[PDB]
Enzyme design. Sequence first.
Site, PDB file in Angstrom:
ATOM      1  CG  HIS A 187      -7.131  70.591 103.493  1.00 11.86           C
ATOM      2  ND1 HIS A 187      -6.828  70.437 104.828  1.00 11.86           N
ATOM      3  CD2 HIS A 187      -6.363  71.658 103.019  1.00 11.86           C
ATOM      4  CE1 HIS A 187      -5.954  71.378 105.164  1.00 11.86           C
ATOM      5  NE2 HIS A 187      -5.601  72.120 104.097  1.00 11.86           N
TER       6      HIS A 187
ATOM      7  CE1 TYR B  45      -7.019  74.214 107.856  1.00  9.71           C
ATOM      8  CE2 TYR B  45      -8.287  73.707 105.891  1.00  9.71           C
ATOM      9  CZ  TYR B  45      -7.874  73.363 107.176  1.00  9.71           C
ATOM     10  OH  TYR B  45      -8.198  72.155 107.818  1.00  9.71           O
TER      11      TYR B  45
ATOM     12  CG  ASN C  84      -4.640  85.474 109.835  1.00  6.46           C
ATOM     13  OD1 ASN C  84      -4.642  86.717 109.657  1.00  6.46           O
ATOM     14  ND2 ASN C  84      -4.754  84.937 111.130  1.00  6.46           N
TER      15      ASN C  84
END
Length: 185
Positions: A21, A66, A68
């Site tokens: 990720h 991730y 904002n």
Amino acid sequence: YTPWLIAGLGNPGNKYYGTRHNVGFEMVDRIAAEEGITMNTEQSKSLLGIGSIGEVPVLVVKPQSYMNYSGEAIGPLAAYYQVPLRHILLIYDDTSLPNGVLRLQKKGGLQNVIEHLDGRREFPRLSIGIGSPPGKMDPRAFLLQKFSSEERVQIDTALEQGVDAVRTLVLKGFSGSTERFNLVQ
């Protein structure tokens, strides 16, 4: 000659490095490494840098969140530098594509749900497929895993190609990217 802001999604924590990720960070690090852009400016835990791709001036950013990234990092910078929305490229891991698969899209779940939450479909976007969580693995773990050897080879390929794609896009737009990279035309 109109500048781009290229942002890659992820997390600057040490534990995130090389995990599924976080691959958008790897991509922007490659871009900056390959284009000679020094990213030595911090805004909080976000990293940034300015340089150019060819004659095009570019700001590369690794936003620390991730959740904002726009508001925190992208928006203010784009504003300052007057970067049109159309020249803000987001790059991030996409569980909706197989591992290593690149996808460059112009503006317009889970992946889909998330995208719809964060408004990401309003920007041009480079997705780096990471596939989806197997069987029924804790999604938390899945996202935190490091690529296996076989997966890494695919991800290396994607990072290599990704740089070039991005260089193309910046230098010749969508049309040039299409021309160069699409088999079907």
